[PDB]
Symmetry: C3
Subunit: 283 residues, 3 copies
């Protein structure tokens, strides 16, 4: 199913008729970082499988819902259960939910992920406000926009110079200073590793020489689709580990360790993004 | 449709029977740089859609013709309307037109493109004679030759050490010196960004550290197919902007600016390539 | 055909019923390096085309057998005729033979390949014990594990920190010292170039700046599938040429030169791996 104007309108048509919510903000949350979706007030849970033209996720299994309601006085829509391209989802399957957000009226998309640290300043449990990226799939002919362009959403050749909104980064840092956890907050450049294998020790060393601060398996596809159709983005990485240190010490990585870091910071991040949503200037 | 010996012979069979032209030179021209195709003498325009086994381009739309005739006393064939891989065309769809050029008797292929400047010496409106490339899709398993090899056209493992003919670069520079615009002409290494998003500021910074002078979304696939079947290549980039400077100054890129640079240099480039065609030693 | 638990069990079911061999070691040999497969004692040759669910190789042609028998008192299984991803084989087609090895009881996989030298210390005819890799397809969303995970074989997110067994590298070096050819043996990092074009001169120069010692078109996919399902790996590159030197001197590469180097070292490598198999501690 192509992520075109007609198909995306058919999904939005069904969603408007079931929720009666016109969302202003969209959110996509990382592994173990979805507690905020459970506190959405006056919420309506819509399974992906019930929405026309939404991608099939029964092979991968696990949760897949669209949740609408209120947070901090603002109306929001949330993807519960993330679509990652290492699962095999196509360019069209990634793009359609974001373009449906657009047709519903979303103007700001907030994103969290788990990622590995490259910069020597990054420790486990730190946060990184993303100010740019290095898109290795995009350079290698696997950009999420490869294919015919859907002119109703954006141009054929998008410029990504301002994909990460400066004002949103400044607002997120300001709130961290008000609650005195700014010592955990950095900024940096995110490298998109297709996955699903973690970055190898020598791949980590190469990324250090290329000026990457952080590496992960998600986020960049959603950022490009949002920037294509004029949605502003804030993206925050939670550092699971420092891969450069782990290479020097021959320390392994695994998803259980990653989830444990997510649990250590889940409540702080939920408090953080709730204040961001409340203070957001909508554009 | 596979770009094999039989299918390519069937397209050449139809073209010979309609044009009565045996071309020696092939040309592929960049965006806004196609004026020379309009001055082809005793010309025959053959729409792609009429040629057996030629790829379907109705989804992307816009022009798609094969034009044959004379330039500077030489017989040439031109692709009017370029096939870019960010549109979604497959390896077989890119390869077939070049191999048809081979079966018609083409021995030299001339190429122009628009590209972003990385080297600090490059300014908007400059030209770069390409002497090598960095093929990020090729490294990432998206090489244009991925698939079964068509032995009638070339070997399984091609060497690209001499894909860009030294003598052609020297001839192109010589003509620029005769008309006193050699101050616009550089040489450098071309990085293949799959597209269709422009190179991000941090991607541009990485390319600077890797010794890339220029980055663009085309050309490398055609160069490899030509080198595979023994066709000599000259490739010239027109610099739309300096992406390293634009990152320092937070200046955006867009296709309208790119086309405006193409218009500023279109007539000079047409004059330049017409003299190249006229003086070419055919091999 | 998906490389899942059921399909792989059906291939192993057929193989057990035809060979009556329970192999402990698997081997995959590079171009021109397959002489050891001819000395397998009490051997049973099983064509790929006769094994249920094995990938179709009639388009590429050439040999495709599974060979079982004894070497050095140990029971082994060998792939005769390698599956390379530049031929167009899918992720599932690469993975199934290795997972069938797993279900037959393989605990150690030994691999040889031909590759180009980047490190200035490497000369034609040298050997490189691989201690890590840089997986350019994997970074670019063409990782061999892209797709749904097959939970019966391994986890969704594998760690590759110890994909190349330290003890096996130490054993291979020890045997080279016992026979006084340790002056030919190095260790280094392997870069995976998707192929099938050889690394370009400027691509070679980039790899030097990134800390790659060796570049080739194979091996990394098999290493990842083996590490996924808990099989230990030793991988050795035979250096066909030094691509950095060849760029400085404008010297070409071709498959005939590569095969000639393979013939120069074939008997030494066969003797080397036969002793490795004999001395292997099985785990
Ligand atoms: N180094 C890492 C570590 C974690 N992750 C993210 O967390 C999950 C896998 O641990 C996956 O959801 C993955 O996106 C990552 O991408 N890269
Ligand atoms: N930085 C740039 C700038 C331009 N281009 C080429 O020009 C058109 C898009 O502007 C496209 O046709 C594209 O090939 C490019 O590839 N890279
Ligand atoms: N520079 C090189 C040289 C050789 N090879 C390997 O050898 C065969 C092609 O020569 C192919 O089988 C290929 O794997 C390579 O991968 N890279």
């Amino acid at each position: 199913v192509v992520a075109n104007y007609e198909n995306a309108s058919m999904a939005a048509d069904y969603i408007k008729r079931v929720s009666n919510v016109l969302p202003d903000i969209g959110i996509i949350c990382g592994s173990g970082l979805g507690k905020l979706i459970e506190e959405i007030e006056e919420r309506k849970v819509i399974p992906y499988i019930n929405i026309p033209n939404f991608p099939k996720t029964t092979v991968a299994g696990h949760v897949g819902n669209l949740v609408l309601g209120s947070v901090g006085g603002r109306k929001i829509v949330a993807m519960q259960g993330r679509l990652h391209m290492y699962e095999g989802y196509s360019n069209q399957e990634i793009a359609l939910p974001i373009r449906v957000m657009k047709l519903l009226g979303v103007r700001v998309l907030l994103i969290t992920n788990l990622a590995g640290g490259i910069n020597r300043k990054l420790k486990s449990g730190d946060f990184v406000l993303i100010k740019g990226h290095i898109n290795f799939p995009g350079l290698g002919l696997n950009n999420v926009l490869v294919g015919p362009n859907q002119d109703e959403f954006g141009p054929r050749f998008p410029d990504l110079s301002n994909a990460y909104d400066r004002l949103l980064q400044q607002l997120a840092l300001k709130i961290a200073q008000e609650n005195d956890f700014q010592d955990l907050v950095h900024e940096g450049v995110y490298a998109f590793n297709g996955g699903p294998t973690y970055e190898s020790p020598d791949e980590s060393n190469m990324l250090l020489k290329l000026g990457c601060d952080v590496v992960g398996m998600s986020t960049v596809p959603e950022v490009i689709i949002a920037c294509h159709c004029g949605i502003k983005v804030l993206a925050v990485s939670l550092i699971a580990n420092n891969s450069i240190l782990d290479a020097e010490n021959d320390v392994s990585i695994n998803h259980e360790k990653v989830l444990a870091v997510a649990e250590k910071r889940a409540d702080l991040l939920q408090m953080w993004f709730k204040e961001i949503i409340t203070r957001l200037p909508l554009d």
